[PDB]
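ERR on first pass: missing label on line 2. Operator R.T. fixed the label and resubmitted. Corrected input:
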Amino acid sequence: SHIPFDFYLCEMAFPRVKPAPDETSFSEALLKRNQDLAPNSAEQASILSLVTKINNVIDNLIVAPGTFEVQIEEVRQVGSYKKGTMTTGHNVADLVVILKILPTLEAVAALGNKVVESLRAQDPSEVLTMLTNETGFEISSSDATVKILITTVPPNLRKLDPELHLDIKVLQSALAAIRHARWFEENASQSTVKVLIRLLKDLRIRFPGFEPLTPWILDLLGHYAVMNNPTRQPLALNVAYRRCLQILAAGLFLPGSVGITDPCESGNFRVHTVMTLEQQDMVCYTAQTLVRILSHGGFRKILGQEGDASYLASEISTWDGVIVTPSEKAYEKP
Amino acid sequence: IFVNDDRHVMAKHSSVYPTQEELEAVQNMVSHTERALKAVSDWIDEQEKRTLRGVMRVGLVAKGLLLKGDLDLELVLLCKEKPTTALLDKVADNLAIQLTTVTEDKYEILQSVDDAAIVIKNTKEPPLSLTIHLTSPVVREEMEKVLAGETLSVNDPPDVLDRQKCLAALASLRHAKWFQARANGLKSCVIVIRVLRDLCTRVPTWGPLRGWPLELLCEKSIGTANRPMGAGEALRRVLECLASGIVMPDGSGIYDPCEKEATDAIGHLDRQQREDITQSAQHALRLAAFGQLHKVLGMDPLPDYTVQIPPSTTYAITPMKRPM
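pass 2 clean. output:
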């Protein structure tokens, strides 16, 4: 029930004595990094192409299944492709397919085969591969992959049997992905939010202290940082990026904190509680170190523009004479 | 929320709160001094028939921030005109006489023209030491006019007291009034300042915050919460504020509400000091979150607090109170 300190929630209470330093270079670096990370045109075209073809086939199966046994209630585009937060080099889109029937491994394989064969019938020259997996199946071209996350209608969930049916965890996560995509389209369809999330994804890769943060937590964190603020305008990217580090450092995701309530669940689920206490400590202490590094002008290292920087979170570093000691673990096993 | 943390903060608070013996000794000496000074004032006035415009408590005595071990008390003596060496000597001399109208306790009276002050020491061991700062609202006006490019027209005694010292004294007076108006009635604020004051003593990294910057930091950070907080949560919020980087060189700093020219109450910290304090609060925050606040407080794990001495009956002031 405790809401940790966030400077950007009460700026009027902390007036600046002197203007903030000029962050033109940081702002430029953030955009350059976003541009580096953003999918190129070829990637954008190949994923659009594959998603469209698959989504068309599935749409058709929905209206005109005919003899086909695996009946489909609905298909939705979800995830990074739908949110506009994809990263270059990972050209994968997700579709959620809600079956009317019980999702058996067998039905999933039949649907996967059915969809890819429809594509091959329409265009024999395009080489695709279709493999089933834990969550449904996936179809790949040489250039792009579309994952079909299978789930089912509500009746069937409380009606599930672990015996022959895809795991409940998988069916629920696919349903959550639809909720997330809907929430995102309505609440986080702002340029700066999508860019910040792409940058956070990258930050997490380069500083594995952030590994416990999940994609949904990053979505919510990016949205919070840009949008949740009394200027009633999206915060500028350089400001929101710093804010992400500050609020983590100030313990947004620590024990005692309300953190961020999941807007796609009932009733008031604190999203960060998917992390263990130890992981909460680590995410916090990693942000705490980076907060300080950023203050000493380490933005290029933080942004990944000066090679590996991961050691900044674990080793002492020096910045124009100032010695920075990384924040260290506080959590203790019971 | 944070029941265990409340317990530890309050236990720590008890450990640092002055004994009744210390508080009685402070009350005694402050009251004697205030009464003696009023007598000095009356005597000057009669010898004229104004010169001394009143005596104000500042610092730890005013704010209720005395802790076990504090020997230093402070008052501000307000003069109608800029105070002079002549007035300082006059006051110091007559004080020795007027004191005998209220007590037989022996007091050493030392004037310090350079400090624009009179220091009084009792004979207890260790002795309490009360500094009487002489100043006038006129010293600020003159300084302000100069900064505003105005020319001073003042037939000045050749011995006006150091304007810098006298300006600092008005500043401490501003702080005391601000403290009573804003910090005192802010739930948990005084308690947290007392505890963090002790922390600043125990942990040299925090030393540079001791006093006004810490008071401001605590009131601001605690006051920005959307609801009253118990001591455990309130302390945590101060830690979160610091952990967020608020005192780092590119942070907003802590705007001094008692200065007309925009002033950072922590602007005196160098880069390494800011770095160290930030890192320390960051670690303390996580210690608190993970059940180890006792380590921050320098204590072993456990198995209206604001008024320390009565307000002056000699120089009674109108009590301002932070709005409900």
